[PDB]
Motif scaffolding. Sequence first.
Motif, PDB file in Angstrom:
ATOM      1  N   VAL A  47       0.800  -1.223   0.000  1.00 27.74           N
ATOM      2  CA  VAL A  47       0.000   0.000   0.000  1.00 27.74           C
ATOM      3  C   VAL A  47       0.836   1.278   0.000  1.00 27.74           C
ATOM      4  O   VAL A  47       0.546   2.213  -0.748  1.00 27.74           O
ATOM      5  CB  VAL A  47      -1.036   0.004   1.142  1.00 27.74           C
ATOM      6  N   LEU A  48       1.876   1.329   0.830  1.00 32.62           N
ATOM      7  CA  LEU A  48       2.732   2.515   0.834  1.00 32.62           C
ATOM      8  C   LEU A  48       3.413   2.739  -0.533  1.00 32.62           C
ATOM      9  O   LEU A  48       3.397   3.856  -1.052  1.00 32.62           O
ATOM     10  CB  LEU A  48       3.739   2.479   1.995  1.00 32.62           C
ATOM     11  N   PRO A  49       3.991   1.676  -1.136  1.00 35.27           N
ATOM     12  CA  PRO A  49       4.506   1.834  -2.503  1.00 35.27           C
ATOM     13  C   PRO A  49       3.439   2.362  -3.470  1.00 35.27           C
ATOM     14  O   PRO A  49       3.732   3.239  -4.279  1.00 35.27           O
ATOM     15  CB  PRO A  49       4.908   0.409  -2.901  1.00 35.27           C
ATOM     16  N   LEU A  50       2.224   1.826  -3.408  1.00 34.02           N
ATOM     17  CA  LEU A  50       1.165   2.294  -4.304  1.00 34.02           C
ATOM     18  C   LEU A  50       0.871   3.782  -4.104  1.00 34.02           C
ATOM     19  O   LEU A  50       0.714   4.542  -5.069  1.00 34.02           O
ATOM     20  CB  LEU A  50      -0.115   1.485  -4.088  1.00 34.02           C
ATOM     21  N   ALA A  51       0.779   4.192  -2.844  1.00 30.94           N
ATOM     22  CA  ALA A  51       0.471   5.577  -2.522  1.00 30.94           C
ATOM     23  C   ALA A  51       1.593   6.501  -2.984  1.00 30.94           C
ATOM     24  O   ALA A  51       1.330   7.575  -3.518  1.00 30.94           O
ATOM     25  CB  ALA A  51       0.220   5.739  -1.027  1.00 30.94           C
ATOM     26  N   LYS A  52       2.843   6.092  -2.783  1.00 27.77           N
ATOM     27  CA  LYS A  52       3.965   6.930  -3.222  1.00 27.77           C
ATOM     28  C   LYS A  52       3.944   7.104  -4.753  1.00 27.77           C
ATOM     29  O   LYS A  52       4.141   8.210  -5.269  1.00 27.77           O
ATOM     30  CB  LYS A  52       5.303   6.344  -2.748  1.00 27.77           C
ATOM     31  N   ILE A  53       3.711   6.013  -5.472  1.00 30.58           N
ATOM     32  CA  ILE A  53       3.609   6.085  -6.933  1.00 30.58           C
ATOM     33  C   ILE A  53       2.434   6.975  -7.371  1.00 30.58           C
ATOM     34  O   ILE A  53       2.546   7.742  -8.335  1.00 30.58           O
ATOM     35  CB  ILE A  53       3.513   4.668  -7.558  1.00 30.58           C
ATOM     36  N   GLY A  54       1.316   6.895  -6.657  1.00 26.36           N
ATOM     37  CA  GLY A  54       0.168   7.756  -6.967  1.00 26.36           C
ATOM     38  C   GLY A  54       0.490   9.241  -6.837  1.00 26.36           C
ATOM     39  O   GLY A  54       0.072  10.070  -7.655  1.00 26.36           O
ATOM     40  N   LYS A  55       1.235   9.587  -5.799  1.00 21.48           N
ATOM     41  CA  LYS A  55       1.679  10.969  -5.624  1.00 21.48           C
ATOM     42  C   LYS A  55       2.677  11.345  -6.710  1.00 21.48           C
ATOM     43  O   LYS A  55       2.552  12.385  -7.349  1.00 21.48           O
ATOM     44  CB  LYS A  55       2.316  11.180  -4.254  1.00 21.48           C
ATOM     45  N   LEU A  56       3.674  10.497  -6.917  1.00 24.77           N
ATOM     46  CA  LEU A  56       4.744  10.820  -7.867  1.00 24.77           C
ATOM     47  C   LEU A  56       4.229  10.949  -9.304  1.00 24.77           C
ATOM     48  O   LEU A  56       4.623  11.852 -10.043  1.00 24.77           O
ATOM     49  CB  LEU A  56       5.831   9.744  -7.810  1.00 24.77           C
ATOM     50  N   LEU A  57       3.357  10.041  -9.718  1.00 22.57           N
ATOM     51  CA  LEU A  57       2.864  10.077 -11.090  1.00 22.57           C
ATOM     52  C   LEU A  57       1.566  10.880 -11.235  1.00 22.57           C
ATOM     53  O   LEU A  57       0.952  10.864 -12.294  1.00 22.57           O
ATOM     54  CB  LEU A  57       2.659   8.665 -11.624  1.00 22.57           C
ATOM     55  N   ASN A  58       1.138  11.547 -10.167  1.00 20.32           N
ATOM     56  CA  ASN A  58      -0.107  12.333 -10.201  1.00 20.32           C
ATOM     57  C   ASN A  58      -1.311  11.501 -10.631  1.00 20.32           C
ATOM     58  O   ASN A  58      -2.058  11.851 -11.561  1.00 20.32           O
ATOM     59  CB  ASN A  58       0.051  13.560 -11.107  1.00 20.32           C
ATOM     60  N   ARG A  59      -1.487  10.378  -9.948  1.00 20.30           N
ATOM     61  CA  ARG A  59      -2.621   9.502 -10.176  1.00 20.30           C
ATOM     62  C   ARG A  59      -3.355   9.367  -8.847  1.00 20.30           C
ATOM     63  O   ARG A  59      -3.094   8.439  -8.077  1.00 20.30           O
ATOM     64  CB  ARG A  59      -2.126   8.141 -10.678  1.00 20.30           C
ATOM     65  N   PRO A  60      -4.258  10.315  -8.564  1.00 20.42           N
ATOM     66  CA  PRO A  60      -4.924  10.401  -7.261  1.00 20.42           C
ATOM     67  C   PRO A  60      -5.755   9.166  -6.919  1.00 20.42           C
ATOM     68  O   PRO A  60      -5.940   8.890  -5.741  1.00 20.42           O
ATOM     69  CB  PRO A  60      -5.848  11.620  -7.412  1.00 20.42           C
ATOM     70  N   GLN A  61      -6.250   8.438  -7.915  1.00 24.12           N
ATOM     71  CA  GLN A  61      -7.005   7.220  -7.606  1.00 24.12           C
ATOM     72  C   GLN A  61      -6.157   6.185  -6.871  1.00 24.12           C
ATOM     73  O   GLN A  61      -6.678   5.423  -6.051  1.00 24.12           O
ATOM     74  CB  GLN A  61      -7.659   6.623  -8.856  1.00 24.12           C
ATOM     75  N   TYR A  62      -4.852   6.165  -7.139  1.00 22.70           N
ATOM     76  CA  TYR A  62      -3.962   5.259  -6.398  1.00 22.70           C
ATOM     77  C   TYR A  62      -3.961   5.611  -4.915  1.00 22.70           C
ATOM     78  O   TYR A  62      -3.904   4.730  -4.058  1.00 22.70           O
ATOM     79  CB  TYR A  62      -2.507   5.362  -6.877  1.00 22.70           C
ATOM     80  N   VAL A  63      -3.953   6.909  -4.625  1.00 19.62           N
ATOM     81  CA  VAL A  63      -3.905   7.382  -3.243  1.00 19.62           C
ATOM     82  C   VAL A  63      -5.257   7.189  -2.534  1.00 19.62           C
ATOM     83  O   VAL A  63      -5.299   6.855  -1.340  1.00 19.62           O
ATOM     84  CB  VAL A  63      -3.446   8.860  -3.177  1.00 19.62           C
ATOM     85  N   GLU A  64      -6.351   7.401  -3.265  1.00 22.41           N
ATOM     86  CA  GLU A  64      -7.682   7.092  -2.728  1.00 22.41           C
ATOM     87  C   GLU A  64      -7.794   5.606  -2.378  1.00 22.41           C
ATOM     88  O   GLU A  64      -8.325   5.245  -1.320  1.00 22.41           O
ATOM     89  CB  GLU A  64      -8.776   7.462  -3.731  1.00 22.41           C
TER      90      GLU A  64
END
Length: 381
Positions: free
Chosen positions: A175-192
């Motif tokens: 989950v933390l890797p997914l959230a970091k990638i969501g922030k880095l690649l500007n993909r907010p659905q990953y962070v949601e």
Amino acid sequence: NAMKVWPVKHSPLLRQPERFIARSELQALIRNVTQNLVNIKDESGQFLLRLDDGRVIDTKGWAGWEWTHGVGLYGIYQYYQQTGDIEMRDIIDRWFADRFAEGATTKNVNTMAPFLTLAYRFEETGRMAYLPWLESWAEWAMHEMPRTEQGGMQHMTLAEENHQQMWDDTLMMTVLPLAKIGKLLNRPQYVEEATYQFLLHVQNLMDRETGLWFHGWNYEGRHNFARARWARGNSWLTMVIPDFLELVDLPEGNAVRRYLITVLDAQIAALAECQDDSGLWHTLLDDPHSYLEASATAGFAYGILKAVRKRYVGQHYAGVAEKAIRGIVQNISPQGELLQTSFGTGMGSDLDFYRQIPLTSMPYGQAMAILCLTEYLRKYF
């Protein structure tokens, strides 16, 4: 020959910090533990993992690709991030270079872990060849990784589906890797998605009777297995919550930020209460007759230090972390091995399962020591 001397030792404000280990010794210790970590190997092939699809996997060697490499890379990365140490940076870059040249391993809750560190290196370097890796693995976590009821991430590993099960370590490893990638690649659905996984893992694993967490949850039968408040498993939450909060960087008073801090504070309060005088915790947190266990202790130390530094919890918890760090340094051998570390631990059906896990040197022991000592170095600035 008399001197002019100003009085300061009487004043809490003026007297210099009392430090049990010097910055230089601590840095040397971290580098020695790192040296141990990257030299762990299974020359005889004792521990090779064999699957009936013909795969034969080295889980011990540095050339392997396990959740343990992910945790180790993250610790090495934090030390690099803090100090600029080029030799540490290079260990990381060589590992990814070697693994990617070999080819991808299969995706599961554990093999996702290294991508947290890859994301940070991509952020720094902009190495275009890293991007397809980040996108493919994040997309898998979003859309392909198996879900339990209520859309929970199922703890599928290399060799087991673990149908309908959610475990403590999922948040840290995937989950933390997914959230970091969501922030880095500007993909907010990953962070949601990541945020939702936090809420659901709390729902199913936290124990309101104690503030501690059970190891596992199964929707099949709606139960927490042995109902084990297992130290190392709990330590993955202590580590991941402050890192996740730091990443999402929510405004104070936001209900999600506030709720996750409440959950973290409750666990840390419980931990403060059951910490042994040596600074270590018992492998079953609530069983003072179970053995003390150092790797879990290192994880708690990291998480409490970080939560204090980020001001998510009260500054007074610094005392608990200080005791744990002393305990950790006391259990690192001259060869850089974290002693009093328990062997690999799956999901137990009874509490005796946890009590009887053998003690032996493990990669995550060294990795977790690197993390907590690197975070402790923050106190020296």
